Amino acid sequence: ACYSELSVQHNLVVQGDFALTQTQMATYEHNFNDSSCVSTNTITPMSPSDIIVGLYNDTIKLNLHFEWTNKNNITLSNNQTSFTSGYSVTVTPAASNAKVNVSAGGGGSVMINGVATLSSASSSTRGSAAVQFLLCLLGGKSWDACVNSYRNALAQNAGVYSFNLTLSYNPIT
């Protein structure tokens, strides 16, 4: 069993020449150490979802695509507490008629909680939490409310290990 809810924060700054290049990528990793992990445990990476981000009263819309660096489960031997996980994010211009998942309001930076999540939770818990998360987003609830319910469900009897991402863009003018 594992019991920690751990998170890490990474700051992505979209560079000015994104106007020309229309692409940017970053691969973030983090060493999680859950000192509460006892016995043997399996940490499973949860399937991510693309995120449409809106900046400057939603006049700039960015597509964020996430991918696990390694899609395999992490097997923690007896009382092994430490593991390293990571993901890649690719930023590109959104399809214009895309619906914004997260908005900076009138500014150019947003916090995006839980862009990528691992959990020690059971197959049954993971399956239902992942379905309810997908249905949460389709129903029109806010990204944060959906992520919060997803974390709460995974963490019931397990550990949750989450990546948060701040995205900032100050285009050249």
List keywords for this structure.
monomer; globular; alpha+beta; 18% helix; 173 residues; Immunoglobulin-like; 10 strands; 5-stranded mixed sheet; signal
What does this structure look like?
Part of the yehABCD fimbrial operon. Could contribute to adhesion to various surfaces in specific environmental niches. One of its GO terms (biological process) is cell adhesion involved in single-species biofilm formation. Belongs to the fimbrial protein family. The chain has 173 residues and is an alpha+beta fold. It has a single domain (5-169), classed as Immunoglobulin-like (Sandwich), CATH 2.60.40. 18% of the residues lie in helices and 45% in strands. It contains three helices and ten strands, in the order E-H-E-E-E-E-E-E-E-E-H-H-E. The strands form two sheets. Strands 1-10-9-3-6 form a five-stranded mixed sheet, covered by helices on one side. The chain has a five-stranded mixed sheet with strand order 2-7-5-4-8, with no helix packed on it. Strand 4 (51-55) and strand 5 (60-68) form a beta hairpin. Helix 2 runs antiparallel to helix 3 (143-154). The longest helix has 16 residues, at 123-138. 29% of the residues are buried.
